[PDB]
Amino acid sequence: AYATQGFNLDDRGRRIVVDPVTRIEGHMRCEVNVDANNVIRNAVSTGTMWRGLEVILKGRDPRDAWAFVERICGVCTGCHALASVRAVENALDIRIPKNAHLIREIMAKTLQVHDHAVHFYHLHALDWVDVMSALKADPKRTSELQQLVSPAHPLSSAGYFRDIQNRLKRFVESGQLGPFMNGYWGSKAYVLPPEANLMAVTHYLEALDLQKEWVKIHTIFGGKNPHPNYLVGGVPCAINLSAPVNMERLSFVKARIDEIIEFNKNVYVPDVLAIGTLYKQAGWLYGGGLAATNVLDYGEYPNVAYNKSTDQLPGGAILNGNWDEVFPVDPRDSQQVQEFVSHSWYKYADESVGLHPWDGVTEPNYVLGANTKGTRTRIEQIDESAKYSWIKSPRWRGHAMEVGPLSRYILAYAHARSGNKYAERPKEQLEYSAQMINSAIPKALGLPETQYTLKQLLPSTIGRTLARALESQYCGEMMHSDWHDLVANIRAGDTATANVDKWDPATWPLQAKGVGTVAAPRGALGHWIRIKDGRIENYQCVVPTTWNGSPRDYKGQIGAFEASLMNTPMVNPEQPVEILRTLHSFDPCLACSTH
Amino acid sequence: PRTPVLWLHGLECTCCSESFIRSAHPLAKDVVLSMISLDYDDTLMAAAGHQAEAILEEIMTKYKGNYILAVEGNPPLNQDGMSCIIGGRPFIEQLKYVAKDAKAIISWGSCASWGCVQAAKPNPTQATPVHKVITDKPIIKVPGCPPIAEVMTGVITYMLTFDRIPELDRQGRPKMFYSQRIHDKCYRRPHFDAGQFVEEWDDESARKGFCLYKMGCKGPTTYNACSTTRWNEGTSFPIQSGHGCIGCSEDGFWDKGSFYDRLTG
Ligand code: SF4
Ligand code: F3S
């Protein structure tokens, strides 16, 4: 046992293993120890995959890199491509034209909405929603709940909910439960009434049909989704009012954006507010982890291209829960972002040191500690005192940080309180949400009104889930504005989409280094490149789930996943309901984390 | 009864799973609820850990020789296979276990079919396509990074309707989707035939939709349904949106030179 970051870690209790962790992207193993009362007192995050993209990129053409690193992940599809072209453009001093900037922003914000909404319904919801309980719901009371939760949503009739319930009934009655097979249904960890469960399952199905429409924005500008195409110097989708982009194509994009705004406002945000309220009422405010102290994001979405002071999700770092002081974060500073491998399956010359990604090294070293139960190819209990993950350990000035929508919303709130007007909308969303969760929704449902502050509500698994939903809504609103700016710019006579001045490597400096950062759906993404004689000399990625899912560092400090599980009671230690609920609130992408 | 599908995940980026749920005809919702029984899939399944593991043996026993194994991603042979760990063991062991009693095996995407990005030089994990590991079972390759959504659901629909693998070419790809090269029916073909090419991004030729051959388009050597079926309910495809085909459905496309270097001859 040892103490770190205000957590008292203790591995003397009962050991529980969850492998595979499901309803995530990629491969993760989680182990915990629980005390005599089933409270988690130790948590261990193990990334169980590695592909070696950083190694594969060496020697290749910087202009091709985006396509390779895009394939780090098909869920957060395109965010790595964006980071890569930004990194290369930064290295080569390339400034992209306004239309390329706006199209990239629209694609980024489309990804945010798609990723967030699909995560919540198709990966996260089953941690809050009991599908079998939905079968016992009254269609009429479910209609009445829907009208209270979101009066503007037109799909609310008793008949509609009855037909959905009937389809669920016959599916279950077939004896082939598919994705619901061997579930934790009926656990006391589930608190929603039957009607809330049926509403949620109905929206699960609605979202599954709708999500395919949203990504058609990627298809127009990038050719396909998943894995739309990008370009160093701009975008390939040339404009002509026989061209990739004309007014009809832009009108199509606007129709999709308008649908997105309706979904976020009428289905997604209200569901999360309602579900959050009910779990708040149950007292389930666990999962804060590092969000209560240390959060980071690079900052994103400048109103004015290349002007970071205008970031609409302004970033930085907060330490020790002090929301009155946001420290600036510089991805170029060798003493800020560093990665350790002390407890990771890699090797450095000196593993007491953290490497900035321009100096990063990725040499695999799969080896298990002396206290392992099992063998090298048949692990029963992983040894977290030694190397236990394919995920590196990123830290900021040595501090362990949480990243993600919650981090961005805490940073936005802090910025807004200091007088940053670019963060006014996120502040508005947060204050609106707190009032709904504390007062409006309880009043509507005949529950007691509560008085939680944002400082109390946000650092929790509920808060982390809320921030994701609000961010989806904000991104939809922002790309609506971007669309108007794009069309206005084109109509004013600027049709440029690519700067080709430095396309040819004969124009390049003989060596260069660059960094590209992105507020990816799961948090702070950076790609760091060194170019030599037209080729990639070094390419290192530090990805949001690398931060959140990181194993312990040289000092033994825990990462966001491990911290978030601490001190959480489990109804039944052999049913990982609470473990999944909190882990899923980070939207873990394990392919991203390891690359 | 609906045919069980056990959808395994090796080393992957999950693009194939994502593409599958974009299908408009049929809807993925209808496939899952009314066509197959998707009994194991890490991406969507309710159960985790021991409860998820228990599903495999239950289905394999009850439906022996009568379930479909779908594989996304691939097994690594380096790091003693532990660069992809499932249930404390190498993925390759899970793959071989579930494969042994499958009626048919679908290799989804370029990862499962050929190796894709992780198998690009120098392949640090020795990522290996499914057919090089499983050599005694019928395998249909559905390559592409990812494949087109309707190609994926089209393969499933055929297999469920007919209880047969569709006719395959010599590389194991379904002829109903992979018989044409992109260049055969690419709408920019009249420009190619007339020697009308984009030569720099956003030049006048690019704004008129001229052929992308000189910008590196690998359509002339790539078999897929992209130029006709197109992407995301026929909305576009790479070439229509202005970027050359990078050859993503072809074996080893990452190591055929820069995507922006034109084909020779
Ligand atoms: S764009 Fe590519 S596929 Fe289309 S005609 Fe030109 S070379 Fe052939
Ligand atoms: S890059 Fe792939 S998606 Fe089609 S157009 Fe070429 S085969």
Ligand SMILES: [Cl-]
């Ligand atoms: Cl390949």
Ligand SMILES: [Mg+2]
């Ligand atoms: Mg890295």
